[model samples]
Target: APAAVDWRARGAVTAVKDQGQCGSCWAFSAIGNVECQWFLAGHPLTNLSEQMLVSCDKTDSGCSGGLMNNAFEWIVQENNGAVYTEDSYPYASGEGISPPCTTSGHTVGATITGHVELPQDEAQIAAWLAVNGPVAVAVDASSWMTYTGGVMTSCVSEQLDHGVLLVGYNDSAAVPYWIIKNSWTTQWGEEGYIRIAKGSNQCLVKEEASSAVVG
Candidate 1:
């Protein structure tokens, strides 16, 4: 028999220290995706620094949110470079620190794997996770700051700031839900994550074929 699928199985979750006020969604998405890949590869769960990308990866704009494709390119070309811990690279109280990965407690490490493009359809995405574990994705978040709960809708006005991890999916609920992990503390959202209706933003699908995976 094949290994039974456990939709409830929790993948590694992370809290993106802070992006201050800049819309570095691209960086957050990139780091979050890479972090999941590393955890799946049986490596220690280290919080990859998004600030490093925010400061260094110039491919995308800091104040304006960027496309996930641009962020993946930075990882591939840069070899998924060094990442700092939260304590080392404390969140910028005002605008956010720029570049060089300079922060206290900052440590350098490699992502066991680099990046992979995610599937565009539900079946395709589910199939990929069935074999590879969890994957990270960028979506038009409801807000840029702390959001606790309530069904996420009215996306037309949602601000596309921040990044999140898509761990699993379940159709068992009256309404299908995509199990996502948020960077906000556990007290926020559905214990630091929320299950939103899949295909809501067509998020599973990517305009460009690009994403990251564990080595």
Candidate 2:
């Protein structure tokens, strides 16, 4: 199921944004997954609030650290797991600290039943992307800070650190790789998007992965 494709071209992947200096990549990862699910489900673009989860979900530290599953769980548990939009509950670092718990009572975003974690394997993740949509996963960003791009050739599995969206892949290319949507900025990597070596499981791409379940 390895077909070369780009999620951006079809307007499935949302525009990447910066996470400032906070360790809230997990929120971005979860938000990206949910956004793609909503888009793929014929609802079009719907930007969810990452800062809301970071600030409200007590299961994970606000900016210190967070888990992708915890964020998803929080989303589905509030007001029967409320769907808050970025417009009403936008991304607010709040001086690099946890933003205020303002996600309460604000329900304005795409509706999703819940999320299901993908198996700990490459094929399952890749197949999900091919058949379903974007997958949220964590990766070892050891060499992410200096990626000039043409397919990442320096990422090594040393333990996952940063959370990112596994948007697409092109297995037919000379150097096959997976498309990654980063929350760093358009000036960072390949216009804020990255391509990691496929098959080799670059940066523990297979160890952790998740996808949203939409109705």
Candidate 3:
């Protein structure tokens, strides 16, 4: 892998989005990986629907909590691998309310045939990310509620409760850090992005790292 990589600078990432009061961060994380993977696969960088997963994925509890890995599998096995466009399905669970799942009149924006889980090694995950685009990860973001800006040097690594997208990392800096894209909107933490100390596995980022496989 290179010393540093930023997928946002490479045009593989879409604009940051907000999950609002909903516990749909898992939906955002899963859709974020799919959006990047689809863009890298010679498609346009489209904003896929997180609401599609929030309301439709029965395997996960809508507006309560979810796992990105389950969302990926549910999309493939239950939804015929089709991820709808944001404009088509749109996000309606922002106010901590989720409507019933709708299955008709939606256009497919992207499709993923499968998913892969990276090893629980930050170095290997970084190496894989350099070539495979952004990855979906679960992290203990409890410490993030007080974060403002700059590289986060202190974070809890014991429990993972929030889902986020791991976009890149820089090892050449005096303090190497991982670039994560959050779903709390552009007004939060470096325009919805955060840098966590990488080597020590800050926030348990290396514990649950995975990515969507685009075809």
Candidate 4:
């Protein structure tokens, strides 16, 4: 059965943010899922810092591009279990120009035990999201460069690339889709969101899905 859910409507998700021309979509993806997991675990919704990963992660290139799985790894390993708040480090870079790490304003905001990669099966993924909260997923959003709204049918790549948050679903609807939160802010795609068709593995939206577990 399709488990329909909307974490954003249930207060598990934070406000949509912009990555600002930087290919740091992975940071937003990891951060959003972590925030949701924290909130669902009966903790306060704390906004984690993305700038820290963008500049200090070291394993991946900041602004140019990155991965969601690696983002969670850095949060757990490099940050030493706890991650800095958005207000602590703040997003100062990823605007087409990667900046140097200042190493200031990094205050511990929230913590996580580790991460788990969700299964690739569509039904299993939906069940996990319904029980665990929003998940960080990367899809082949290559053709979505100019996509404004509606179902993203122009997905030309089967391999995932851009990172996004799977916040909800509506499988009972005519065009059953997975509701996703984006880092591009509210100015883009259904107010920084998109509905990708499910069952068919549209653009591999659930290909690299995973989430940070809050302890």
Please report the candidate that would top TM-score against the real structure: 3
What is the alpha-carbon lDDT of model 1 when measured against the actual structure?
A: 0.57
Model 2 segments more than 4 A misplaced: 103-105
lDDT of 1 at 44: 70
Tell me the tens digit of each residue's lDDT in model 4 across 58-166.
7878887888888888878877777788988888875577667766657888888899998887788898888888888888887777878787555775667788899
lDDT of 3 by residue, 1-215 (tens): 89999999999999999999999999999999999999999998998999999999999998999999999999999988899999999999989999999999889999999999899999999999999899999999999998888899889777999999999999999999999999998989999899999899899999999998987
What is the lDDT for 155 in model 3? 93
Q: RMSD, model 4, all Cα superposed? A: 1.6
Q: Give per-residue CA lDDT, model 1, range 1-215, as digits (tens).
A: 11223333544655533445666656665677666666667887677766666665678775566666676676567644444554455445236435454434556654433556765666666667666765656666655244557555444334444466666666565666666666555666776667666556543322233347545
Regions of model 1 farther than 4 Å from truth: 1-11, 15-18, 79-106, 112-114, 142-162, 184-187, 199-210
Task: For candidate 3, give the lDDT of residue 93.
Answer: 93
Using lDDT, give the best candidate's number.
Answer: 3
Worst ten in a row by lDDT for model 1 = 1-10
Q: Over 4 Å off in model 4, which ranges?
A: 1-3, 102-104
Considering lDDT, which of the candidate structures 3 and 4 is the better prediction for this target? Answer: 3
TM-score of 4: 0.94
Compared with the true structure, all predictions reach lDDT values of 0.57, 0.84, 0.94, 0.83
Candidate 3 or 1, higher lDDT = 3
RMSD of each: 4.3, 1.5, 0.6, 1.6
Candidate scoring better on lDDT of 1 and 2: 2
